Amino acid sequence: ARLPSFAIPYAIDVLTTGSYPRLPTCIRDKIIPPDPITKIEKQATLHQLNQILRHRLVTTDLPPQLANLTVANGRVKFRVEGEFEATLTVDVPWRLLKLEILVEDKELVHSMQISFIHQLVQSRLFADEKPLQD
Amino acid sequence: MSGVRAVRISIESACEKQVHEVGLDGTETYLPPLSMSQNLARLAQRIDFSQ
Amino acid sequence: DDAGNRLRFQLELEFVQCLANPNYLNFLAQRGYFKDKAFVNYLKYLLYWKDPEYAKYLKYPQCLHMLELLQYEHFRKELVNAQCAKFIDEQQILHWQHYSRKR
Amino acid sequence: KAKRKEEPSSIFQRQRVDALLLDLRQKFPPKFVQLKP
Amino acid sequence: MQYIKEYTDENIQEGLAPKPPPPIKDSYMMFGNQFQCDDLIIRPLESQGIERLHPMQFDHKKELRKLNMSILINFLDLLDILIRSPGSIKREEKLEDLKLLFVHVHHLINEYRPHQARETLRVMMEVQKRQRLETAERFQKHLERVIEMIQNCLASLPDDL
Amino acid sequence: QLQKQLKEAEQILATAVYQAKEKLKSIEKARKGAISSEEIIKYAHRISASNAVCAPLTWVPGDPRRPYPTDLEMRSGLLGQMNN
Amino acid sequence: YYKFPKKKDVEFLPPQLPSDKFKD
Amino acid sequence: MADRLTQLQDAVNSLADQFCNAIGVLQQANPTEEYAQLFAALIARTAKDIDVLIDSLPSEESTAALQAASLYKLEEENHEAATCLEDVVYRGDMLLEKIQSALADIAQSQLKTR
Helix, strand or coil, rough: CCCCCCHHHHHHHHCCCCCCCCCCCCHHHHCCCCCCCCCCHHHHHHHHHHHHHHHHHHHHCCCCCCCCCCCCCCCCCCCCCCCCCCCCCCCCCCCCHHHHCCCCCCCCCCCCHHHHHHHHHHHHHCCCCCCCCC | CCCCCCCCCCCCCCCCCCCCCCCCCCCCCCCCCCCHHHHCCCCCCCCCCCC | CCHHCCCCCCCCCHHHHHHHHCCCCCCCCCCCCCCCCHHHHHHHHCCCCCCCCCCCCCCCCCCCHHHHHHCCCCCCCCCCCHHHHHHHHHHHHHHHHCCCCCC | CCCCCCCCCCCCCHHHHHHHHHHHHHHHHCCCCCCCC | CCCCCHHHHHHCCCCCCCCCCCCCCCCCCCCCCCCCCCCCCCCCCCCCCCCCCCCCCCCCHHHHEEEHHHHHHHHHHHHHHHHCCCCCCHHHHHHHHHHHHHHHHHHHHHHHHHHHHHHHHHHHHHHHHHHHHHHHHHCCCCCHHHHHHHHHHHHHHHCCC | CCCHHHHHHHHHHHHHHHHHHHHHHHHHHCCCCCCHHHHHHHHHHHHCCCCCCCCCCCCCCCHHHHHHHHHEEEEEHCCCCCCC | CCCCCCCCCCCCCCCCCCCCCCCC | CCCCCHHHHHHHHHHHHHHHHEEEHCCCHHHHHHHHHHHHHHHHHHHHHHHHHHHHHCCCCCCCHHHHHHHHHHHHHHHHHHHHHHHHHHHEEEHHHHHHHHHHHHHHHHHHCC
């Protein structure tokens, strides 16, 4: 003579949602460092990310030309004129360390001690004084 | 019931933000704010092509 | 005769519920669950017990979750210690009250 | 830890670049970070 | 004694040698509380299986009055047996019959409320879908109007400059 | 000024399009996998009686149940002696 | 690397290079 | 609650408790008066719950066959409307993306050329 249990939440969950959303889904996370998100979704979202990046770059008032302006596909071309260094991204964030300066007529190129320049770039970016000009 | 005449209706309940945050012996809450504007460009990954 | 109606639910659903129950989580990595090469492959080759293609005898749920998460060599490697297994059991035991204190 | 680490044939000579490197935080003041977003 | 050995050895092959799709399990089994066989109810109705006394009206008030009269008669018989002599065992039979009738009434109530609950859930889902479609149409109209206004402003600015 | 206005309008339209795409994907997922109400009601009745899927009829303050079905059905029932 | 990247201090120069292989 | 099954179960439990209390009092001085008042209140609550389950809850009439047919028709209509709205939203999103791309290109060209 036990009355029938309704369990409106669990019933509505098991009615059409054939999964375990209304429960702790951190089994593979609390005892394993698995990838939470952005597993393969980045593949299709890369086009929209690049579009948004280009839109934000165009919207942001860039500095003068100064023979250092460059624009191409793929990402934001920092500078390619002559021997200028190249870089790209990865409010709005500001990434770095995508390429480097170019030279020729060796004497054997410079080694990775250039991190000093990268350290200064990161410090000046996190200072947020004027990223484009410096 | 149990084999009676049925109607293939569509059931669309509320499934926006369930109890997703892991709890420790009760006292849990929701954390899903659906920040699509912030999640537009937030996928920390490797720019180098590996796929 | 026997390949049709003798192992579809006699040794498939019961074995899936046994290998996927939280009580026998640590009581199954002794006979060989993921160490064999043809074990996870044969399990995935017979993972049509709870999908939308065999919804006529859906009685034992959570079958595919085991082969999806545990047999992925990520969760089965770890959690062999005492503290990790106790924490996992404590975190999974509280999931049996998702209808009373879910507000 | 055997294949490679920093640089094999990373010869001085033009290391002189170093020499000038010793100009640059000086040509311009490093900005404070303290932000690991 | 809990591991995939027989099935994992029968399915240890490549190509179409593996097992086919699992058909309907229509044989002996113990899944949950039933034999895992469809079209098999667990409890019978109140008008099928036993003698049918209530008419086709199935009025809530009439059924409640009948259940109250049955309970009163059972209590009176139990009191008479306790007072006069315990040589009457009809009390336990009447109590078991009342328990079975209550189980059948609960099953019928659960069967009747499920259809109405499903209809209400479907109506609510249709209303939610209509509201979402209206919100999306309003957002699209607002975006189109904003684009039209932006274009008009851009065309007007080029004339004044 | 026109570019800022158009960028705001495009952000609003992109948010609306994302919401609409999410709704359409949810509708397509709901329409892709679905069966008659008969099997759904049968599974609900088979899983609501015992303490297998959620809190059974024997619910009390602070149920000591677990995510597993039970211990007696797994120690001696058809769950722990499927082959032995 | 991720971690916290709170390597402030100063220096930001040095060399971090190696090629000692010519009788010197 | 505000549901048919929940209210039905509540009324059944109340009726069972009232019947059990009556049977206990029949087969067992202010305490007697208190027990009589409690039994009267339980009987009144059971009568009210029965009246509610008879009036508010759907009776044997007004079947749900035509209701399910209308629900299926409305679901098909809502699906068609949602598909049309999604097509219109995709068209608008593509138009907005093209307009934004053209605006950014024009801006970059005007900046670089001055």
